[PDB]
């Protein structure tokens, strides 16, 4: 229509709004009841808003279009269409101004901070409680002075008419119109440069920028106080009839009527010369009425109606989940849709869904009209309608003709991830249930216990082409969350295949030879041999040769009849070995995956369908079933339980003799019950799992049992070892609601009856779990909404940015366990640098190569330990990411195509598993390797051991090929029994430490001499009359005297002559201070060896909250402090609770001082040389400081590691890319440290793209570029921080962002996805992307 390019917002000038309005409304009347006609000058006055009916004059003067576009003489109504009623806005004119409640009440008082006034004063003047002052030079009274009534009278009775004092509305209007902007701008900036206080500086800066925003928008600030108030058109605030002739009035109409009434009252009291207090009361009521109209409930008590409910003001029509933004602009209701209960249909091919005939007829009724007239069977739409409503079977023939290639979309609420909507080619069935193919039903997360599903039909041919090419289920084989296929069988299919491939030691026809799988099928179907019988069969297989031909091979192999039968369906090219074992769920999954990699898409689809058919058929023929005799109870159980209860009695009587504390008695009982439960479980599994049967020759032999429940568990079709354990073994301990474990475990299994007590205590867990999931759903949905909002802008916009930067990928290893191999972390990513063959300079993998499966296998063969890959966070693309930095698209297998929206994919991929999350002294070598130290400094002693002065060293055990095997952190001062590079074996002790104390280490031998210490002041003389030998303890600051304050207890080391030995490498003396409350085992004046120690020192949350805190950039409550500077630590002044630490740079001239608290244990002893980003004290880690110290790569590695850790603990797989993209989206805001020659002001928040572009052009013309630091804002703030104010207003805090944009004079270019979705043009992603490129070229041409 109007083809707008952007949207602009600003304050409303009163002349502008008056120009909008086609008239003023002056009376509260709404509609006549005698005749349903609007009153003149009323809220629905037709003379203003136009006629109620098309070209119908209120007076009845004119009735038809012959006079279209003329005004009736008897009345001012116009001969036009009713649509104008929707458009035209009225206006009302007030006898007094009124503050617009938004600018007052918004969290920063924009008017208040503009005028520097406290909000209490502003409300006390605007609400008519006090006067305020405007000054004249003859009076000492200054302007903006608050003035109470007694002060008002006191001032006026001496200086009346010399100064002036007014109430809130008029005074604020006059003040705003009586101030200049440039003078206050310059005074504010001069104060900013002259002042120092950071609070004062930030207030000054925000005022400066507010004034700059007002001047650059040119919006006269006084406009913030309304003087003329718009009237919403009648249709948007409809008055709707009711039964009995009543009418529901929209609350907006009542608020408007109240405001009109108050305005009329105030004008009448003014024009008849009322006394002062009366008109003041009336105008205060009018101001309150306007506040109610705009934002009822925003201040004080909310207005309410007869229903005792608060009325919904205008602001409530846009705020909240019922608001206009969320309810209608997004999430429209749609035509051509249906819903129905779903149902299994196994006879369907993969790509076709069974759609009830009635729904098809209803949906395609327009298409049927069309084709029926086209084929000449019906002449007019009435004929078509009457024919289709009579269902003349020719309509059924036409209906079968129309849909033959017409895909439809199936959707299941909630649409957790994009698989939730899929496309199918319909097939017509009588009945009323929609029939799905079970395989895709598994992907839907759907079930068949009564889940409904909704169906939409695309209209246009471009739309149906999109549905076919993109959405058809034959395309969505690979999940976006990971590369593994999503179309995977379960339940009966897996059970059937498992039964079909399981062999037994002796069966009908064992040992015969079959010339081909067809004969195997014959012998099975003719009943002369059972599936399980082992036999030799001649089989042909094929392989993809070096050229790409399917070269054949034929041979005899040992197999089972069932296995040959299954092989017969396998397509050419897969090796026979894939089948020749007991096929579980995982085996079938990897079989489908290997089919998809070796062959194309369509052979895999056909293979899937054939698998489904054969599995179902043979499962049915199997007749597997569950019976009460199957859940065998191991007869050992009674004995084990008697033993356990005997031990319980023993420990209980041991406590009865008082030999132990009750807590340890509880612990012992719990331990023995757990041990007994495990023993019973093992006995049950052993008895169930295997059984003895006679062989062919007549002897007993063991084999895997065909017990039904065991077969179901072992196949992986359904159930688990836990459920089997509960079914037959004793189910064990259970927790009280506090999470503590009841001493008496539930002893009876499910097969025997549970007593009432066991059942009752068990119900605790059941209701705990149900409440748990009920609550978790909401948090998961909320989190997903957030992630989507933050990442929705990001789209692949170019092929290659040309960045050599990237991140280093190594396998994730914790505590000697390889939690994640390198192949998974690097598959599908592009090499940032050329990979070299280990130990050589030869290039193994070139730079900028997408690492597919063959490259990963090659990397594994050469045992490459680390790779460097391109990352989303390191991409140089502006307003997007390049295809090479993102890498392989999980859903397709190759490099991602241009124009794909990746952020939304990542957001859904993170959100969906969230439904599954839960929410309420020595080192031993594990295996062979070599010991290496990551970062260490070590000293060796007379005992032959090694003691370490690095506080964050890690042992790493390395493979003979240089790959890592194990790694473990080692505390300060631990003792080590081995040198670096020595060989190690499993179970070998290599290092030791006391975890219950902190030592202090002396590197060189010598004679200790106490220094800077006095007994009873810095140290006190412990003689442990109750414990043992003499000792000395440093007196804490509360215990030490003032003489012990500046004297810091220490010991120097001296030579044999008593001369103070120097540190071996520095000019500092070998001086070792004793921290507060430190303990030393040695007295003054004793010898100590090199590498020897003397010091004694006194020394979890749920997954979903943890991930929420990570992505919200939450500051941890005990932030570890790290060295902001490279230098030497140094002590200094002391004060209450906090120590004045200082770091002194080695070469730098700028020391820094920090208020390090003393209650946290310090890891610094006045000798620790330290570098930037090194830990000074431990604790939870603050992401912002990590970013400041160690850069973007450190923080991205930290975030990805934590999120992957929690998810892998749950067992869900999510590729790192979807976390890295979120991290890059978090990282937009930067701050300017110097402007160079740029126009940017210092300390401003700027989007990283803008400053990057500005610096690039600035250096492109040779000027000094600006410098910046990047700030990790939380995802909520980062989503609100965007320039696209429309998206922000859609998301949260609508009033705040609207006010901010309004005062700013913001403009949004409508470049993201959400904005275009609101507007309704094509999104700039996917197929729409191309449409935009031409447009932008035209916009470049324009």
């Amino acid at each position: 229509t109007e083809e707008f390019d952007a949207i602009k917002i600003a304050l409303a000038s009163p002349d502008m709004i008056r120009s909008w309005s086609f008239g003023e409304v002056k009376k509260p009347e709404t509609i006549n009841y005698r005749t349903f006609k609007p009153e003149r000058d009323g809220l629905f006055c037709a003379r203003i808003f136009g006629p109620v009916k098309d070209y119908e004059c209120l007076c009845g003067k004119y009735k038809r279009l012959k006079h279209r576009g003329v005004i009736c003489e008897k009345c001012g109504v116009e001969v036009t269409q009713t649509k104008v009623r929707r458009e035209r806005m009225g206006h009302i004119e007030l006898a007094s101004p009124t503050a617009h409640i938004w600018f007052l009440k918004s969290l920063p008082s924009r008017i208040g901070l503009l005028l520097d006034m406290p909000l209490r004063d502003i409300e006390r003047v605007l609400y008519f409680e006090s006067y305020v002052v405007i000054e004249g030079g003859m009076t000492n009274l200054e302007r903006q002075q608050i003035l109470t009534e007694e002060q008002y009278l006191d001032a006026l009775e001496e200086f009346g008419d010399e100064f002036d004092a007014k109430m809130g509305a008029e005074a604020i209007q006059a003040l705003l119109k009586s101030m200049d902007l440039e003078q206050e701008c310059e005074q504010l900036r001069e104060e900013l440069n002259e002042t120092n206080s950071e609070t004062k500086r930030k207030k000054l800066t925000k005022r400066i920028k507010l004034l700059e925003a007002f001047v650059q928008s040119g919006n006269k600030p006084e406009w913030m106080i309304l003087t003329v108030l718009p009237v919403l058109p009648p249709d948007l605030r409809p008055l709707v009839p009711l039964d009995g002739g009543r009418f529901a009035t929209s609350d907006l109409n009542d608020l408007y009527r109240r405001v009109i009434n108050r305005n009329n009252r105030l004008k009448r009291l003014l024009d008849l010369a009322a006394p002062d207090i009366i008109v003041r009361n009336e105008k205060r009521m009018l101001q309150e009425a306007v506040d109610a109209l705009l934002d009822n409930g925003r201040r004080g008590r909310a207005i309410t109606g007869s229903n005792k409910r608060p009325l919904k003001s205008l602001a409530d029509m846009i705020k909240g989940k019922q608001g206009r933004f969320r309810q209608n602009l997004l999430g429209k209701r749609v035509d051509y849709s249906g819903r129905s209960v779903i149902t299994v249909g196994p006879y369907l091919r993969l790509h076709q869904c069974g759609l009830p005939k009635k729904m098809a007829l209803e949906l395609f009724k327009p298409f049927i009209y069309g084709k029926l007239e086209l084929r000449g069977l019906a002449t007019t739409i009435k004929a078509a309608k009457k024919m289709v409503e009579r269902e003349e079977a020719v309509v059924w023939d036409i209906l079968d003709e129309v849909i033959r290639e017409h895909p439809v979309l199936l959707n299941r609420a909630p649409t957790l991830h994009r698989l939730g909507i899929q496309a199918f080619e319909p097939v017509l069935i009588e009945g009323k249930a929609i029939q799905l193919h079970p395989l895709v039903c598994a992907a839907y997360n759907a079930d068949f216990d009564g889940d409904q599903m909704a169906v939409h039909v695309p209209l246009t041919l471009e739309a149906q082409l999109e549905a076919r090419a993109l959405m058809m289920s034959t395309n969505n084989i690979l999940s976006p969350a990971n590369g593994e296929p999503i179309i995977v069988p379960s339940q009966d299919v897996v059970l059937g295949l498992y039964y079909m491939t399981r062999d037994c030691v002796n069966a009908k026809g064992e040992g015969m030879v079959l010339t081909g799988p067809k004969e195997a099928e014959r012998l099975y179907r003719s009943g002369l041999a059972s599936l399980h019988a082992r036999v030799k069969v001649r089989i042909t297989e094929y392989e993809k040769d070096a050229n790409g031909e399917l070269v054949a091979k034929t041979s005899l192999k040992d197999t089972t009849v069932g296995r040959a039968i299954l092989w017969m369906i396998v397509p050419k090219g897969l090796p026979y070995s894939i089948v020749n074992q007991a096929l579980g769920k995982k085996a079938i999954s990897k079989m489908l995956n290997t089919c998809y990699r070796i062959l194309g898409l369509k052979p895999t689809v056909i293979f899937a369908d054939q698998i489904m058919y054969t599995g179902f058929a043979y499962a049915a023929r199997s007749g597997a079933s569950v019976g009460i005799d199957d859940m065998v109870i191991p007869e050992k159980k009674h004995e084990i339980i008697s033993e356990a209860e005997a031990e319980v009695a023993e420990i209980q009587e041991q406590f009865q003799s008082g030999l132990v504390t009750a807590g340890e008695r509880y612990n012992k009982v719990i331990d023995i019950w757990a041990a007994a439960n495990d023993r019973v479980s093992k006995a049950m599994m052993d008895n169930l799992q295997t059984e003895t049967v006679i062989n062919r020759d007549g002897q007993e032999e063991k084999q895997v049992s065909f017990n039904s429940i065991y077969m179901m568990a072992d196949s992986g079709a359904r159930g688990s070892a836990a459920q089997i354990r509960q079914l037959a073994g004793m189910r064990g301990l259970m927790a009280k609601p506090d999470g503590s474990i009841i001493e008496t475990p539930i002893t009876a299994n499910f097969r025997e009856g549970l007593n009432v007590l066991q059942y009752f205590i068990s119900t605790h867990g059941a209701r705990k779990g149900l409440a748990d999931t009920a609550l978790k759903t909401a948090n998961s949905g909320y989190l997903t909404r957030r992630l989507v909002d933050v990442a929705q802008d990001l789209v692949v916009t170019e092929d290659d940015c040309g960045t050599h930067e990237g991140i280093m990928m190594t396998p994730v290893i914790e505590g000697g366990d390889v939690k994640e191999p390198l192949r998974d972390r690097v598959l599908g990513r592009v090499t940032a640098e050329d990979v070299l063959k280990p130990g050589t300079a030869d290039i193994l993998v070139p730079r900028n190569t997408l690492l597919h499966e063959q490259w990963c296998d090659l990397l594994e063969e050469n045992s490459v330990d680390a790779v460097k890959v391109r990352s989303v966070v390191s991409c140089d693309t502006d307003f997007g990411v390049c295809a090479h930095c993102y890498g392989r698209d999980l859903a397709r297998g190759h490099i991602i195509n241009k124009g794909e929206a990746i952020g939304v994919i990542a957001a859904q991929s993170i959100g969906e598993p969230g439904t599954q999350l839960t929410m309420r002294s020595s080192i031993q070598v594990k295996n062979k390797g070599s010991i290496k130290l990551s970062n260490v400094k070590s000293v060796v002693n007379s005992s032959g051991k090694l003691v370490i002065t690095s506080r964050n060293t890690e042992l790493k055990l390395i493979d003979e090929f240089g790959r890592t095997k194990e790694s473990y952190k080692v505390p300060y001062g631990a003792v080590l029994a081995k040198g670096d590079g020595e060989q190690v074996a499993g179970g070998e002790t290599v290092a030791n430490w006391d975890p219950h104390t902190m030592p202090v280490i002396t590197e060189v031998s010598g004679f200790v001499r106490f220094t800077d210490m006095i007994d009873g002041q810095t140290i006190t003389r412990q003689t442990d009359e109750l414990t043992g030998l003499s000792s000395l303890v440093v007196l804490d600051s509360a215990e030490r005297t003032a003489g012990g304050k500046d004297l810091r207890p220490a010991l120097k080391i001296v030579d044999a002559q008593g001369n103070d030995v120097l540190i071996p490498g520095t000019d500092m003396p070998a001086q070792y201070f004793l921290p507060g409350k430190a303990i030393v085992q040695l007295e003054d004046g004793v010898q100590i060896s090199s590498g020897d120690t003397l010091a004694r020192i006194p020394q979890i949350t749920g997954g979903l909250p943890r991930v929420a805190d990570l992505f919200e950039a939450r500051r941890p409550k005990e932030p570890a402090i790290l060295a902001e500077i490279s230098g030497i630590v140094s002590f200094g002044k002391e004060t209450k609770g906090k120590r004045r630490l200082v770091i002194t740079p080695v070469d730098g001239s700028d020391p820094y001082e920090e208020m390090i608290p003393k209650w946290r244990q310090l890891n610094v002893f006045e000798g620790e040389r330290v570098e930037r980003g090194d830990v000074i004290s431990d604790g939870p880690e603050a992401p912002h400081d990590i970013l400041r110290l160690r850069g973007v790569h450190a923080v991205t590695r930290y975030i990805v590691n934590e999120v992957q850790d929690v998810y892998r603990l749950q067992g869900v797989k999510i590729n790192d890319k979807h976390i890295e993209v979120i991290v890059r989206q978090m990282l937009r805001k930067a701050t300017i440290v110097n402007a160079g020659s740029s126009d940017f002001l210092e300390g401003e928040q700027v989007e990283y793209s803008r400053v990057k572009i500005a610096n690039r052009e600035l250096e492109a013309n040779g000027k000094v570029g600006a410098t910046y630091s990047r700030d990790l804002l939380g995802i909520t703030k980062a989503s609100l921080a965007t320039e696209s104010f429309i998206s922000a207003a859609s998301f949260q805090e609508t009033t705040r962002v609207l006010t901010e944009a309004a005062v700013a004079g913001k403009r949004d270019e409508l470049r993201g996805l959400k904005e275009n979705v609101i507007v309704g043009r094509l999104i700039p992603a996917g197929t729409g992307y191309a449409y935009h490129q031409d447009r932008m070229r035209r916009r470049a041409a324009g």
């Binding site: 339940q491 059970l495 569950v626 019976g627 179901m712 359904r718 159930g719 459920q723 089997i724």
Partner: protein, 50 residues
């Protein structure tokens, strides 16, 4: 008359329902026998003792 999937039973742990099924097969069993014992129209004393 009705065919149910067995796979649900171990994973939902509705073992009791299987027992119900067994009792059903027992219950109608007696019914069937007594039905036949009625259909042959034999002496009521025999069915009384049964």
């Amino acid at each position: 008359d009705i065919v149910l999937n067995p796979l649900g039973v171990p994973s939902r742990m509705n073992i009791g329902q299987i027992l119900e099924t067994h009792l059903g097969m027992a219950a109608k069993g007696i019914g069937d026998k007594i039905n036949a014992m009625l259909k042959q129209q034999q002496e009521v004393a025999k069915l009384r003792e049964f």
